[PDB]
Curated annotation (Swiss-Prot), chain A:
Keywords: Acetylation, DNA-directed RNA polymerase, Nucleotidyltransferase, Transcription, Transferase. GO terms for cellular component: DNA-directed RNA polymerase complex. The lineage of its organism: Bacteria, Pseudomonadati, Pseudomonadota, Gammaproteobacteria, Enterobacterales. It catalyses: RNA(n) + a ribonucleoside 5'-triphosphate = RNA(n+1) + diphosphate. InterPro entries: DNA-dir_RNA_pol_bsu_ext_1_sf, DNA-dir_RNA_pol_bsu_external_1, DNA-dir_RNA_pol_su2, DNA-dir_RNAP_su2_dom, DNA-dir_RNAP_su2_hyb_sf, RNA_pol_bsu_bac, RNA_pol_bsu_CS, RNA_pol_bsu_protrusion. This is DNA-directed RNA polymerase subunit beta. Signal peptide: none annotated. The keyword DNA damage does not apply. The gene is rpoB. It comes from the Bacteria. Its EC number is 2.7.7.6. PANTHER family: DNA-DIRECTED RNA POLYMERASE I SUBUNIT 2. The modification N6-acetyllysine is found at K1002, K1180.
Amino acid sequence: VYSYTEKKRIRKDFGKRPQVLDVPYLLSIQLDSFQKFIEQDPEGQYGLEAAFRSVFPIQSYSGNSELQYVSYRLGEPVFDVQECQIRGVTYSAPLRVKLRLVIYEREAPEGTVKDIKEQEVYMGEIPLMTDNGTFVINGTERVIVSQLHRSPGVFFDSDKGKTHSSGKVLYNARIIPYRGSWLDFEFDPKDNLFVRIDRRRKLPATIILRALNYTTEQILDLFFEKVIFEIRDNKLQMELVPERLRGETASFDIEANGKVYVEKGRRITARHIRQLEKDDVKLIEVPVEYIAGKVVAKDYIDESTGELICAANMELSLDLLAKLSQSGHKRIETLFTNDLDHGPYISETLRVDPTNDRLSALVEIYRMMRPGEPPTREAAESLFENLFFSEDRYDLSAVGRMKFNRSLLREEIEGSGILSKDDIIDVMKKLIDIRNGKGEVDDIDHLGNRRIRSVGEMAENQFRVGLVRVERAVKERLSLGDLDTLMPQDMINAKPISAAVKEFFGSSQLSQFMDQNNPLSEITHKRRISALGPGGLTRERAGFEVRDVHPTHYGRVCPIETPEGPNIGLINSLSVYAQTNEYGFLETPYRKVTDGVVTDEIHYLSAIEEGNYVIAQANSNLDEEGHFVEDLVTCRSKGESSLFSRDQVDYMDVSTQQVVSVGASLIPFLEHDDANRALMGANMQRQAVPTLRADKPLVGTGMERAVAVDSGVTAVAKRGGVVQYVDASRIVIKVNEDEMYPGEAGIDIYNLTKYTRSNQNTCINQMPCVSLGEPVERGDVLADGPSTDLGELALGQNMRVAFMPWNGYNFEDSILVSERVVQEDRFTTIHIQELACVSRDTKLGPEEITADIPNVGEAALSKLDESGIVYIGAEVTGGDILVGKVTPKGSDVKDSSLRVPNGVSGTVIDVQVFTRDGVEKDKRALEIEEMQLKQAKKDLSEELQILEAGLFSRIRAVLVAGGVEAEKLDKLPRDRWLELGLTDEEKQNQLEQLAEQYDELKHEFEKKLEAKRRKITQGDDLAPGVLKIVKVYLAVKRRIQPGDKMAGRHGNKGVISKINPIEDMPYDENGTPVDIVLNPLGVPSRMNIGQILETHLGMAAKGIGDKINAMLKQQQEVAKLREFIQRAYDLGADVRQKVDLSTFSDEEVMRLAENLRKGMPIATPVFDGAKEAEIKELLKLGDLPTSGQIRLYDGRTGEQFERPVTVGYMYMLKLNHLVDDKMHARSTGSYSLVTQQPLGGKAQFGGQRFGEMEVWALEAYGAAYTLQEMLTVKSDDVNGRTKMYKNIVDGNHQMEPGMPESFNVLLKEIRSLGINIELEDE
Amino acid sequence: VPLDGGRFATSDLNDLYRRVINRNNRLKRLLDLAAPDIIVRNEKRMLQEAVDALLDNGRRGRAITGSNKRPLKSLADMIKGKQGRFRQNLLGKRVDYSGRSVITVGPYLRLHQCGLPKKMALELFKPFIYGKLELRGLATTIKAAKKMVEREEAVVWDILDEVIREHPVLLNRAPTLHRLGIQAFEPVLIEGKAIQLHPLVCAAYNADFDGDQMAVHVPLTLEAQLEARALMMSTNNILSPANGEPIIVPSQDVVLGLYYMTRDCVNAKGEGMVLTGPKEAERLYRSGLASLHARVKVRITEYEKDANGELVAKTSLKDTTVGRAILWMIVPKGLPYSIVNQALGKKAISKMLNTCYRILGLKPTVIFADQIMYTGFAYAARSGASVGIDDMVIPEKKHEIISEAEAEVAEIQEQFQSGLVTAGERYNKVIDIWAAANDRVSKAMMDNLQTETVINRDGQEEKQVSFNSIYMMADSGARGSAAQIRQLAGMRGLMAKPDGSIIETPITANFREGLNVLQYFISTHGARKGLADTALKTANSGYLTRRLVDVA
DNA sequence: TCATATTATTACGCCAGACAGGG
DNA sequence: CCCTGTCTGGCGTCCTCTCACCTATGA
RNA sequence: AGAACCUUACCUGGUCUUGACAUCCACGGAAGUUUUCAGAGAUGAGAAUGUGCCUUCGGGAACCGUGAGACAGGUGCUGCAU
């Protein structure tokens, strides 16, 4: 079964693997994020409720008043989106917050407040999101791009080689909070442990332990295990668990139980450890040279004399043993400092530490953090207890606590946001374990360690900044609060929240201007994952590995769609199937594989889960049950693509598109292209201009439908049904009854956006693709947008291309084009330019909008009215006048009248004017007022009458259970109608019900039309300051010409060189010329062989189209057409499509065959595409030669090209790098102010920067005079250039050079220091 | 200066000077009032820091800022840096009488001239046109002439063709690295908006035609016109200054046209007939009685200059082809016939132009470079040398080679399950057998491409080098190598992960067969590393050229 | 409108060049 | 006193094109 | 390039005064169509028909009627103001 615009032109779909999961809605990142930001979500997470439950209730410092929260709301926007783009306002909503002030008496923590007050106060306006994922910030339509940043939680990084210049590795460990202070631990090459906070000075790390109220003995209890020396019969024996001897040299005689176990000299092996454990060896008598290097663990004091023997962490000598042995401390605890495993890093750090107690530790930390200003007990304790341990200024989020517990192998995943003692101690322990050998480092490119911020998270963080500023303001006003004479807007202020949130949505590194020239380009700028932005890395610094593709990108980030240039691999684009995790990570779908049978259930994984499992490949042959048909299958285990068994796998890839994105999965035959040319192909495919006549890629991938629907450029039907099709203004859809609400009778009226300006000066235009009285279903398309054709996606157009050298005109990458391409207007794109004119009151009175243009004669008053301004429409070019806008006293008049820029033509399509309340002459301003005034009422009544007509009929329709008398129901016409009684049995109050409808309709229409006139009757609506505001919309129509840039989908760039006549083209023996000749020499080097298979398969597609065009032109009854269409849709191997063609009612075959006579469209999906034998077999169904190559004659000489050439249909696109936006020349005009050199650019009429390497190139020749005029006369020296212009126009090519002006500018800037630079003797 | 509006966008130095003067006025008033010691110490210290911030901002602790957090630019920051006065306004300047547009080919040109559009030509040559108009007497004042060319009447185009004629222009591609990136041409006017640039000259500019742009500059004075004609003309730059190699070497289409022209096949039309000169060789090719490559005894007259500047004619019968005689009609007098008797790839045509320059000098080498380019384009057009899907011949031996390698990795992993061998020796044995299987697949496809054609002549079969399209694009040296044609037919090797170590499972599928998903992802590792390397390598290359031309 | 005058983030990679520390 | 980690400054590609956004205060 | 009436601007009487000719509101009536007696006639008084284009019904555009004025009107003078 198919929908009704699916039976229009059903694309022949190759593809063997049955898809199990359909493509998700391609704009779901932006929409789900911003729907999380604004939503009334009780339990607080996440959203605006999290912000209000963090900041509220505010209580002041015992001020006995506590403003609390109830509920918030967003009212209607005062401007809908279209008139918002026209006017220039933000597309925002007012944020109505209920606030409840309660005020206490004296001594009321528990006492009832003395008075309350509560109101729906107004703070800020937040910009809402348009239904397509965009904002409208100041008239322009902008997009917030999702950031990719390091997750909160601990990271164990190495930096193995570069420091110390000695090959000794370090190991640092960064505890990155979501909000607050950064804490880093790091080794130094003396093997000492150092802490630093916020990249400040370096403190030896155990001082932070001494800041957490840990004595030295507790620290040594933590990071070291005790070795027990017992004072015994002789020589102070040792408890020895045999694990501690692993891998060391036996220094002494190892004997016990009257038996010599291990002698001196040999290293202790694990067999000797087994001997000591089997022989149960713990207590052995040591020599005195064994204890002479060890370190004591805890303190010991001489008991009788009452003083100290040794401090904790002290190495031992023999006389120290003579001190402690004679006192009476029988147990001696020593620190086991294994040189292999258990290193003495904490102990040597304690030897570096200049502190001894907690208080000096806090004083040293306070002298680190805030220097100069003194370190007192209260100040240092408040500093360190609010560094990490308070809920205000340090907060690992839920993501941070999950990563923090996961990297430390904790069991739980939810905990408190602040740190604790045990967390810092665990980070130090894991860092020490990594130094010892056990456990390993983390990498930063691993996408399980890399979170995504999106629109709702970033706007929520900015909103929380605004709320903490307004709570500091509320704490300010409340302690100065006098009661009861204030209500909660003398306390609260709508200014900082609105200021912060407009600061982010206006001027941020991620709220950026939408690339809008293409449905692809909109939908792939909204799905963008940037590494840049605040808190992330920069373009000009880093690096090599963060610009590189890591094995966790499989199915999360597109490997091949990243922009070439200064930021490669920072501006990654998101994959097709990849959602976003609850915590913000990238989870991608996989198919759960319990046993041999691959189950059709899906299950989402992130990269910290994808490593543990074994995940199969998308294309591994499985037949009829899910069993892998091989006994071994390529999978990947832990980022390593390897071959595993038939029955080990736990997951399989869902579909074979899922590695790449929606820009580079529209490229058919992707798997045959090179990676570089697929990158260049996707990046150019974003840049296509919408042509005037949209044309359906013959070789597509089938993802055109989802991109053209999911990007909101087409008018997808909301509720299904039929159609009324007024359409000149709007599509009117009557709704079928099942999808139709009981009240609100209701028919859907779709607004078509006709010719208007895009963000890239292209033309966004919608055209209805459904006729009158034609069924449409829910989700079906109704109006084709820019670059769409019946709901598909038509960026460029499909043309007949020959691969051959043709007389040098396609030399390096150039492209030689027939005249049949430029006669048919099949690339003639439409550009629209907005031009503003304002008459601001700079000085010496205000400027004026009058045609009475001066000095200039009967060449001003022409394309305008008698009162000034361009008169609309017209064939305006360059140097014309659009808006007469000149002042007197500025015989002292001038010409600021905004004219048409140099080189452009066009037609004035629209003139907008919300000017300084006065623009009118004696009456046009109020003349049109009456026109709109009468317009509103007309439609207002019309619509009512339209429904009235439907209701009147409905009244009679229902008039059967309560008066069906046809001759007794046609009484009053426009007066009343139904007048019958009923009583009970069946409910027929319908008449009464519909009576209310009409009654309310007229009653509401009056009010509806009452406000209409009110709105109509007005000067105009805009902001203040600016006075004369005239915007004129030209529309140039640019065709194609020698110098434009065209390109296919594979990376084959080209500058169209010669626009040949039709005759000189290479025609085949049938007679048709070829349209575009490309060059075969690009194909062996640039290894993008996919354009040839697109060429052959498009040739086969148009072969079927020519065959259907013959069978339908030379008209046959529909049996032969349905037989040939059925053969065309069966065609070859096992596919997914076949068709159910004998259910197309003998007319839907014919409408399909009317839409196929330009070529049968073929879906070649991304990595499961059409094989070559099917291309040959399809070329045999059409009557074309199997090789794909036709013999071609030459249009010049009439004689055959030897060795037959390739002709086919490639889908070639026109990129928006047009040659009459690049052509520029300058002889003489205006310059800058500071310098005497020419200005730069094209919009400024400026000259070429003759840069540094061109000066070196002229020095490389003997061009001393060319360089002398190149930097003195042509550029800078003012006397030289005026003398040169007069010398040229006299006929004397001679320069009088002088000295450059910018060098005298250099002399004054150097001399304006204390520097006396001069110019010496003659 | 104020920007468009009603406020003044003030410079940073005005903030610096205004603060120094505010503080200096405060300090004079405090020394008037006899404030105590600590007040005037803070006041003089704030003046010291204000002066030190004016002169070189930010050399002291954190730099002052006006709007918003960005520091404001001081005098030393008007001198130093990439955007000071030296590197931005004194070494490189913006320049009048200059233009810029997208380039395109135009192969009809001679190599001393380039195409230049009429609109750019009328804008760059406004003063010369004014001077010419004032000389004739058509107008009087300068205004009249500016109205005439603002209207563009019918008489200023003859004025423009009379100011162009012998006046060179400097074409310049935007990343100029060596001196061959600024060359002077003579304009030929173009209906259009794109600079037509002679193709051979493109190999000097590193200019393809994928969207490139070039700037035109006009030598105004008379010494500069003579420097453009006598030093910087494109006929004068035919050897690269880095070495002795010619830089006007024929690049890509023209070597394919020559390699298809001067070649041979073991049977064609007119095999082994005898011809009385190269003129009737071209007459037999055009009328349709012989083929472009058909071996034939001709009678050619080569001029060897064995005396002291005297050209001696020797005429003989060379066993050659038809195409070699047709190309002999274009060779100048002094070169011997054996310069065209071979197959003429790219190295051979480069040494053809080099021997022509060493023997016959400059002017025959310029006119012979043009005739090479014209005949290469013409017979490459007549060749019809396409590229198809059938041209990339898969080796029949490729699948058995892959199965023998799969049996070998199976033996090595069965030893790995039983622990006989070490892990590093296993990884080394797997990389060694996949390198050996890769070389065997490349030799299978290279035999299957280099001698695939086997055509008989009057009897039993006889083999020859192939006329496969991708093989002529590889063997000619036009575009392609062994590695690229290897990756289109044989397996594309063992791609390496970004760790730097190689991956033990190769990409056994070429591009004519489809790559599956994992193989394309490993390929994207290998290609993303290359794009990142070029886009970061170019900065160090440019900074190296800067340090070198400033030490020189 | 017309003088008043500066604070609560961190996440480059060498590579010279100068400086306090210690055998 | 001669090695020495450590800290501080000083580099980091040319040319071009499009768009938007610009200090608070205040009797 | 045509005075019986008309034309006609002149005389004699009989008459009109926002007017024969226009625009504007206010508000009375659809315009108009037919017919009657007195009078030199201008005009001053009667009998028959119609309600069309559109109304949250304070009403409208064509065409008569009345009053207010703003104005209309002048073949009145100056061809020595033009």
